[PDB]
Amino acid sequence: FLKVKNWETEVVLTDTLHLKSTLETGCTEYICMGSIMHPSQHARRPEDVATKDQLFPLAKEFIDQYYSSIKRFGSKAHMERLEEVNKEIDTTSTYQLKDTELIYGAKHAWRNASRCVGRIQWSKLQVFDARDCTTAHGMFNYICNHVKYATNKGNLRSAITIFPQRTDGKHDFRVWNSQLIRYAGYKQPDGSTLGDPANVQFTEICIQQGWKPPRGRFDVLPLLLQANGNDPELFQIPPELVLEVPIRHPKFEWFKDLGLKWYGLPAVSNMLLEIGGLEFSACPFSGWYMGTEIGVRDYCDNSRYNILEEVAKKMNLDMRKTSSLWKDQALVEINIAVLYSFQSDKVTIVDHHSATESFIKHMENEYRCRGGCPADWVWIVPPMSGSITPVFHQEMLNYRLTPSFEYQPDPWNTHVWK
Amino acid sequence: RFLKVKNWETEVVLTDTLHLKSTLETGCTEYICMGSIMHPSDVATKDQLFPLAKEFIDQYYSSIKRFGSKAHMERLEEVNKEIDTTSTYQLKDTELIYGAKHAWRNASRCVGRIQWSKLQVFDARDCTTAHGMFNYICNHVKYATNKGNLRSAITIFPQRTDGKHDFRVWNSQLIRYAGYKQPDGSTLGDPANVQFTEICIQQGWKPPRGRFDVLPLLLQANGNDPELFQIPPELVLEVPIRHPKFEWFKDLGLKWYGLPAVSNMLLEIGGLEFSACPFSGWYMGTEIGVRDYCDNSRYNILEEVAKKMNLDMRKTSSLWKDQALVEINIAVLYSFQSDKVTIVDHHSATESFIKHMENEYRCRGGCPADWVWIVPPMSGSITPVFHQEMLNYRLTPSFEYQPDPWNTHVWKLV
Numbered sequence A: 001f002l003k004v005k006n007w008e009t010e011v012v013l014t015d016t017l018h019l020k021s022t023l024e025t026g027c028t029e030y031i032c033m034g035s036i037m038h039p040s041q042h043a044r045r046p047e048d049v050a051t052k053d054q055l056f057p058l059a060k061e062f063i064d065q066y067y068s069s070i071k072r073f074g075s076k077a078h079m080e081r082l083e084e085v086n087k088e089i090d091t092t093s094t095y096q097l098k099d100t101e102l103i104y105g106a107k108h109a110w111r112n113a114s115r116c117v118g119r120i121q122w123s124k125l126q127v128f129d130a131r132d133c134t135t136a137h138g139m140f141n142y143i144c145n146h147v148k149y150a151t152n153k154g155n156l157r158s159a160i161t162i163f164p165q166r167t168d169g170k171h172d173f174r175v176w177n178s179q180l181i182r183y184a185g186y187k188q189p190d191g192s193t194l195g196d197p198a199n200v201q202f203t204e205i206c207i208q209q210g211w212k213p214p215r216g217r218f219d220v221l222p223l224l225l226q227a228n229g230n231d232p233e234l235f236q237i238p239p240e241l242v243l244e245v246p247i248r249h250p251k252f253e254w255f256k257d258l259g260l261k262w263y264g265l266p267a268v269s270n271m272l273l274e275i276g277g278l279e280f281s282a283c284p285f286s287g288w289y290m291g292t293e294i295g296v297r298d299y300c301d302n303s304r305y306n307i308l309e310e311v312a313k314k315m316n317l318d319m320r321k322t323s324s325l326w327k328d329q330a331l332v333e334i335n336i337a338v339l340y341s342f343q344s345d346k347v348t349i350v351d352h353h354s355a356t357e358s359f360i361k362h363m364e365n366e367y368r369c370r371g372g373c374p375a376d377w378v379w380i381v382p383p384m385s386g387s388i389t390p391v392f393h394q395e396m397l398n399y400r401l402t403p404s405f406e407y408q409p410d411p412w413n414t415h416v417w418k
Numbered sequence B: 001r002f003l004k005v006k007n008w009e010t011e012v013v014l015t016d017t018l019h020l021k022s023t024l025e026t027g028c029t030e031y032i033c034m035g036s037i038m039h040p041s042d043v044a045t046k047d048q049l050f051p052l053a054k055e056f057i058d059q060y061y062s063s064i065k066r067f068g069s070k071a072h073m074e075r076l077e078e079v080n081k082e083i084d085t086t087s088t089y090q091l092k093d094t095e096l097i098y099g100a101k102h103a104w105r106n107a108s109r110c111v112g113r114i115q116w117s118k119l120q121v122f123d124a125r126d127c128t129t130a131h132g133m134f135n136y137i138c139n140h141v142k143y144a145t146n147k148g149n150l151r152s153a154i155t156i157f158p159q160r161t162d163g164k165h166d167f168r169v170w171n172s173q174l175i176r177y178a179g180y181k182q183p184d185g186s187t188l189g190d191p192a193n194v195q196f197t198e199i200c201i202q203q204g205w206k207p208p209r210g211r212f213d214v215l216p217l218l219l220q221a222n223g224n225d226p227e228l229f230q231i232p233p234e235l236v237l238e239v240p241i242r243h244p245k246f247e248w249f250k251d252l253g254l255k256w257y258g259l260p261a262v263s264n265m266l267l268e269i270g271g272l273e274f275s276a277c278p279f280s281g282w283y284m285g286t287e288i289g290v291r292d293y294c295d296n297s298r299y300n301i302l303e304e305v306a307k308k309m310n311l312d313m314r315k316t317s318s319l320w321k322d323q324a325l326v327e328i329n330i331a332v333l334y335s336f337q338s339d340k341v342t343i344v345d346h347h348s349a350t351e352s353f354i355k356h357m358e359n360e361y362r363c364r365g366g367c368p369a370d371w372v373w374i375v376p377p378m379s380g381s382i383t384p385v386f387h388q389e390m391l392n393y394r395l396t397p398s399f400e401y402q403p404d405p406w407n408t409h410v411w412k413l414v
């Protein structure tokens, strides 16, 4: 067993769940890689279509886990399911998840996501089964329905849409966008950047694929959808599906005149969902924002919107030296405005104080019922005001459980066009 | 083998080979990361001490471009003689200085390491009594405080022998404020120091019972019972805290001391253990303004400041805590700068650490760094270290945690 202590409350939790971890963290007894973005390349099956002795053990492990979860280990259905998966692999080199296994797998991938502060909600995930999809047009239909369901007029609901699994790696379904809704970024003639600098490369691909850019600071990017390994196709999300919040400040009347807004729905679409050896390379999932994701990182990273400049100017702060803390002061105001604006418009949002408090409660629940909760301190602690949130003083153990969400290469690095 | 770290702001990529020289354990395994654990976990035998000493001596003669020299080989034989005959050995003055500076250079949790090569080392290995320790510590405080122009320093007392004759400073820092738990459950002074304050009172200290009572030194020499000493008040530089815009901030009656001086850690050099080695630098503002003042378990002044700012404290999403936190840290920095007492803000400190880290990769092949500790406790992502990948590993000479002495000391009075 391993213990974790909270240094504010002195609560000690005892971890045994880590004994079920399967993948390497990247660390060793001599080096810790906890701050590395992608510490490990340890995967569960090789880089493409596995042989039977590579895939079946991963399948059996997950089927065993699912049937244990419902108190039916060794039951009739469990043993038939194993025989069924065996035959499927014998005749197709893969197998197909039942609807129940798919739902279980998706929820537990979220439950196992050690970087996610939002996991107290993990069992409240709506799962849309899109495994019958065959074209990029059908992918667009599924994504539109997902966006409409999840947005729900501002009462946001967590959802995931799961497209057909990888087969031989030449027929991948992929959403090329990193999120379903993101703003364009444009390389300016003088050298600067208009819009979101994170998306300049993706923006140029879209233009390179025929997208006519309106060239503004908040241009919603088109969807770039790839189905069955074919070349990707551009689609415009209907604007009535894209809920946006104008950013205003409860005290500063001039804040409105900054002309800022942001979208309500955070929807990650470039990760990979791994269940029992199966790789779902297109599995867009969405929830609701923690305010700091917009106000600290989107607006105030140097390589992003970088608006600390303007806000501090309008505030008449002394930007002559760092020790006036003008950056910190403007940072707080911007995050006040983001929360005030979303709350005013009745769009679901959580502040980092509430979110981190929820996560401590979630940790305690998971230790009580599951014997552990894998958690990545570097990612869980908010990017501002860390030490005045309870997670700062909370020791955490990070380990990798399956099913899981994984990073995957950007498809433009790997796709050979037609 | 090589390991790469990337900065996701700048895209700079650095190549770590120094990790191959790492020694003891991180706490992590191949399947669990313990990077957010506070401390993941009698005296060395002859056969244990030999290889540790050789590795250090090898390192030292390599750093002075004398590896394999006649002087290198004779030092090794000399060290081997001592261990063989006395079960320990004694460092040369040059080796002690090198070792102390490299323990700082190797401190993966320290953001202030750009200054590592400018450390004043005070050799106190001839000290035999607690009175002598007091004298050494007073001289250290005076030299390091330097009328506000602070200078980094370390004082090194005699090493462990059999573990029954340890030298120890029982204070966690040389200068700290007392904390007194009241019968009604409230705290006067610094809640972090309530327990140590109790021990001092038990030993005979007469407490003023104020909010900023400098604690007395509790000094243990040669394994004897520790003894109390009052630091001369003229040696304790303090800064009253005021705010450049809120004139009411001074009415809070806050102050802090200028000299941060850790006194409860262990310095390991070549297998030798220096259990009493107080070292001092200058503050980063957030150490006082964020943690010392605004930790729930410390002075916890967010509420009063927020009240005087007329903030809406009914809902967390008004971010009144965040707003007060910034204002307190503005006051800390403005106050020290006005009194011309050395301090560094977290933006300046993290920028310099990135410069340091890059230079260490270029000239040394790496820089062990603990991201969890390096990133400041506020405004994390608007500092450059937040976006900087880091590798953590343990190089020696090193500073280490050690048990609190009141948990292991065997008393002898009455």
Ligand code: HEM
Pocket: A110, A113, A115, A116, A117, A118, A119, A121, A125, A158, A159, A160, A285, A286, A287, A288, A289, A290, A293, A350, A355, A379, A405
């Ligand atoms: C319901 C409200 C949710 C909140 C408030 C939330 C919050 C967050 C935050 C703040 C991060 C840090 C990532 C960053 O800052 O860039 C994160 C990471 C993550 N979240 Fe959640 N999340 C939520 C829902 C979900 C859902 C529904 C899923 C999956 C079904 C999920 C899976 C993940 C994953 C995999 C990561 C890691 C991303 C990476 O490594 O890049 N989250 N979450």
Ligand code: HEM
Pocket: B104, B107, B109, B110, B111, B112, B113, B115, B119, B152, B153, B154, B279, B280, B281, B282, B283, B284, B287, B344, B349, B373, B399
């Ligand atoms: C010169 C100015 C210095 C600055 C601005 C500085 C800054 C810091 C900061 C902010 C921390 C984090 C600790 C915390 O937040 O509680 C730290 C840790 C540390 N510093 Fe430095 N430091 C300085 C000088 C030194 C010196 C002179 C030494 C040793 C000779 C040293 C050794 C350490 C060690 C060992 C730690 C780790 C302490 C622990 O693990 O609890 N520092 N430093």
Ligand SMILES: C[C@H](O)[C@H](O)[C@H]1CNc2nc(N)[nH]c(=O)c2N1
Pocket: A007, A392, A393, A394, A395, A396, B035, B036, B037, B038, B372, B373, B374, B375, B377
């Ligand atoms: C549990 C957690 O590791 C602990 O609160 C750490 C986090 N990071 C820190 N970072 C610094 N500089 N100082 C600290 O005391 C801590 N505390």
Ligand SMILES: C[C@H](O)[C@H](O)[C@H]1CNc2nc(N)[nH]c(=O)c2N1
Pocket: A034, A035, A036, A037, A378, A379, A380, B008, B386, B387, B388, B389, B390
């Ligand atoms: C290098 C460092 O690990 C990297 O910048 C991480 C730090 N912690 C983070 N935490 C969150 N939530 N999101 C991030 O993108 C990052 N970035």
Ligand SMILES: Cc1cc(N)nc(CCCCN(C)C)c1
Pocket: A266, A267, A268, A285, A286, A287, A288, A289, A290, A293
């Ligand atoms: C579903 C969800 C909700 C939320 N509030 N945040 C996230 C993380 C977004 C960043 C993920 N990384 C790939 C960049 C996801």
Ligand SMILES: Cc1cc(N)nc(CCCCN(C)C)c1
Pocket: B260, B261, B262, B279, B280, B281, B282, B283, B284, B287
């Ligand atoms: C020499 C020095 C200077 C400075 N500015 N900070 C420190 C860290 C003290 C923290 C110790 N921890 C156990 C809490 C040391």
Ligand SMILES: [Zn+2]
Pocket: A027, A031, A032, A033, A034, B028, B032, B033, B034, B035
């Ligand atoms: Zn680790």
